Design a protein around this ligand. Sequence first.
Ligand SMILES: Nc1ncnc2c1ncn2[C@@H]1O[C@H](COP(=O)(O)OP(=O)(O)OC[C@H]2O[C@@H](O)[C@H](O)[C@@H]2O)[C@@H](O)[C@H]1O
Ligand SMILES: [Mg+2]
Ligand SMILES: [Mg+2]
Ligand SMILES: [Mg+2]
Lengths: 68, 284, 48
Amino acid sequence: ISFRFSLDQQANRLNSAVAVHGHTAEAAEWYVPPEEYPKSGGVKRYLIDASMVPLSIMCPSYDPVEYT
Amino acid sequence: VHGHTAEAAEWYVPPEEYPKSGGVKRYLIDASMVPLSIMCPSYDPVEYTHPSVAAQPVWADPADPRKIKFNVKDEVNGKVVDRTSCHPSGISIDSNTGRPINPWGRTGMTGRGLLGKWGVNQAADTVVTRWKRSPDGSILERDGKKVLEFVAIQRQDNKMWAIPGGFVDNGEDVALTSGREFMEEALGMGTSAESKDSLAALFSSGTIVARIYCEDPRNTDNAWVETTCVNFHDESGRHAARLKLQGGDDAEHARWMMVHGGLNLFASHRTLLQHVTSALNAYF
Amino acid sequence: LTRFKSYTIDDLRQKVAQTFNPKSSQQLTNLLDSALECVQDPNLVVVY
Ligand SMILES: Nc1ncnc2c1ncn2[C@@H]1O[C@H](COP(=O)(O)OP(=O)(O)OC[C@H]2O[C@@H](O)[C@H](O)[C@@H]2O)[C@@H](O)[C@H]1O
Ligand SMILES: [Mg+2]
Ligand SMILES: [Mg+2]
Ligand SMILES: [Mg+2]
């Protein structure tokens, strides 16, 4: 049955998941770090949204902290 | 061996009784007088429009064909329509009345009939396929080729079997149309949160099989259906096993069927089954 | 099974035209569609 399944497994594209799920975006999942820096002793960074993550977006209210 | 036997020149001829017309008969013609490349001087077709189409619904074009631009994408009521054919010569318009002429051959009936739109009724078909597997798990093989299962619905109009599909909505693409037709007709959704995610994973991979003129009985000289076939193949079969089939909207019963060469389906769906078994290299 | 892999449409059509003799294309098409319509559910047919 393993040899028969191995010989069975040896043997204009479009996406239509809009009509089942709705207005669901698979893209624009930009990485956002956590606001607590690791091993910083409770030092918190500036919390921002995922749309304000890249620098191609403007984000005028983004005030990051400076930590070394 | 046979003699003077011609395998070609088998042109499609519709039946002379129109479907659901109340006994209205069209002009009976021969197979040699079917295409418009032949002359046929004695061809006198009748002009018939349906009274459901004559009450002007929301899915139908208005009764005057003037100022309607064909062979290009048009804006009707702020909505995009395709309005073009797969014919190489293109759609021709008669200048005496404004009505278009079908390039695929005369059907013996004029006007719109049961078809709501003038010219090309653009249709999208959903062929969802899985491999025909055993209870042991091996894929079934006939005549040296693998054997496909496909979802088929049963139509409420003619009480016989067809593939899922339908006419295009105004302002919608074919991926929304084939998905809404498979949700309403085949799946029966509307009329799950994991089975819908497996259905979206099934519907994420869709290839265009063909784009062909339908051999429907409802086609007249000024209205004809051309369709595009979208195939959804489940090679693993895990996404197709989670779909619970229930008949809804324009479908009575929906079930899995085995594709073969002697299929008796509505219009020219056997050509779409031959195209999807040519594309996926299966039995036909 | 392995012996039934050579089974075709055309030998079944020649079997139906052997035993019934419908003398029409449409009656042979309707009897072949009825004989393929009986065997569509695999649970309902038990062959002894
Ligand atoms: N352009 C149109 N022409 C006719 N009827 C229409 C149209 N648009 C909407 N309708 C209405 O909507 C319904 C059509 O249902 P669909 O699922 O859109 O189409 P259906 O008739 O179920 O399937 C047609 C299928 O058959 C094939 O010839 C072709 O490939 C098409 O996919 C009918 O009840 C009809 O009243
Ligand atoms: Mg519909
Ligand atoms: Mg339908
Ligand atoms: Mg429908």
